[PDB]
Structures are given as structure tokens and as C-alpha cells.
Ligand binder design. Sequence first.
Ligand SMILES: Cn1cc(Br)cc(C(=O)Nc2cc3nc(-c4ccccc4)[nH]c3cc2C(=O)NC2COC2)c1=O
Ligand SMILES: [Mg+2]
Ligand SMILES: [Zn+2]
Length: 313
Amino acid sequence: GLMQFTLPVRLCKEIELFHFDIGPFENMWPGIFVYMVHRSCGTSCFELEKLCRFIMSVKKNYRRVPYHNWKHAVTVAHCMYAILQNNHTLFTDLERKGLLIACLCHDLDHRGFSNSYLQKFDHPLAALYSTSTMEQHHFSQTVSILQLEGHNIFSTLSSSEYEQVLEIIRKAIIATDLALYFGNRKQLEEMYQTGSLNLNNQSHRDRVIGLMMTACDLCSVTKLWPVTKLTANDIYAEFWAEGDEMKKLGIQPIPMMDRDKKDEVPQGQLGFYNAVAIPCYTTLTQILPPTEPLLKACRDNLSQWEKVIRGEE
Ligand SMILES: Cn1cc(Br)cc(C(=O)Nc2cc3nc(-c4ccccc4)[nH]c3cc2C(=O)NC2COC2)c1=O
Ligand SMILES: [Mg+2]
Ligand SMILES: [Zn+2]
């Protein structure tokens, strides 16, 4: 009950900033996550014995892939933690509880391949879930870990609070399907501008939590340049492996996935920042103004990719 996690001084301060990197010491990531839950939520939200057993089962069920791995889970939960802490009064107790777990669980048992590749391979998951294939699987894997003896961190919620939180986590994880981001953001842009945005309308809150999930998921582009650049090697390592597998099925991959086209990476990052990242954090800054540091860090990194193209690094 009276047992806080404390971090060393540099982490205790930097963890509150959007651009915080959780570092290369894996054994500290669980304590960082618990630290974030205790400050975002209270030392009571969860039974420590139970939370600790849920965190280590989740860890176990992420794979050793270059990008979509345990480090990503915790990094995406941290960005959510920073958004929640800079917007204290906008979110319910339930939403704080559900969204940190949603983020930690959002890529469970990812194998390093897109929904596209599962469908062209004809993977069994592609017959069971025809859209948002991996995302329906990640939510499925979350419910499975919650129902292991001694893993139900929500067991002290009322039956109705319990159904509300699983529903928040389900919509939160499905929203990490980038194919659903483009339409969700368009609707939010139209609602915010025509003045109809209403955070007491549940379907509007749904949409907003969805945008938050895309912003946390893409938060590699909001870090200091050296973190952003080294993460891109990890991201491209999964993409090019997926490309190699496309060629094994006799399909030319899209250029993003073709390792023969390493040369064009800088221009391909420009497109990504311009079509996805900048508009994501722009709309997110309009709805939730304290998240502006994410938009500013993203613009700084676009400008660093422009410098790479102009031969200046
Ligand atoms: C999910 N997620 C999380 C992060 Br963080 C970064 C990424 C990411 O880098 N995306 C991209 C990298 C790319 N590189 C090239 C490219 C490389 C070489 C030669 C020619 C082209 N084209 C690219 C397109 C995208 C991309 O998705 N475009 C969106 C807009 O329509 C779908 C990501 O997909
Ligand atoms: Mg994902
Ligand atoms: Zn992810």
C-alpha cells in the first residue's frame, strides 16, 4: 500500500517530458511503467502483486522483432502517460486505467508483418479477422492474459466499470490500425472547425482517444533527432524483411519495403511526416493544446530529414 516506485533524479525529471527515451536497460522498463501508473492513476488503481504479474506476462508475449517489441510497448505507454499528465482534468479515472494498459498491450504477439502480408500469405489470422487483423489479435491476446489465474488487475471494478474499461481498451487497440487513422482524423478536423466537437458525446471521445493512440504509436518521430534516426533502422529492418517475404511469394514489394531502394529512405520519410505524422499531431494539438511539444518535435525531425536529402548529413 505505502510502496512507491522512485526513479533516479535524471529519470524522475525527464520522464514527465514528451521526448523521454526509456533507455537501453530492459530490467528498468517494468518499474518505469509502474511508476507511470502510480502517478497517473494512484497507488490504489491496481494490486501491485497482480499488476507485476500482468506486466511480466505481457512482456513474455511480445517477440524479439526489431521494432514491434517490448521496448515499443513501454515507449508508447510513456507518450500516453505524458498526454494524460498534461490534460489531467479531461479524462475519467477509468480512461487513465484503461489507456495505459491499452498502450502496453496494443502490439501483443506482433510477428513483424503488416495486415497486407498476412492476407497475401493467407495466414489463419486473416480468415478469423478480415479487417484490422493484427489489432483484433492484439486485443484477443490482452483478454487472454487478463483471465490467467492471478492476472485480473481490474477484478475490484464493478461489473459495469469492468465492461466499460474492456470496451475502452478494445476501441483503443483497434484505432492503432493506421488504415483507420486517415478517416478518423478527417472527421475530427471537420468537427473541430465547424465547432461541433463535443467531449460529452461518447462517439466524439472515442474518436479523440483514437487520435491519441495514433499519436502515442507514432511517437518515435517526436523524439530527439538521434533517437528518431536510430529507431528508423529498426522500423526499416522489419519493412525490408517483409519485402524479402513478398518476393518469396513472387510479388514486388512497395518501395517502403524494398531493401534495393535504401537510397530513397529520406524522401520516403518526408512523405510519411507530410501525409501522416504532421497532420496527426496538428489535429491533436487543436483538440488538446498542451500536446504542442509533440507537434514541435515532429516538425524539428521533418527538418532534419530535409537536411539529410540536401547532403548536409
Ligand atoms: C506505422 N509506422 C510508424 C512509424 Br514511427 C513510421 C512509419 C513509416 O516510416 N512509414 C513510411 C515509410 C516509408 N518509406 C518510404 C520509401 C522508402 C524508400 C523508397 C521509397 C519510399 N515510403 C514510406 C511510406 C511510409 C508510410 O507508411 N506512408 C503512409 C502514407 O500512406 C501510408 C510507419 O508506417
Ligand atoms: Mg500495431
Ligand atoms: Zn505499435
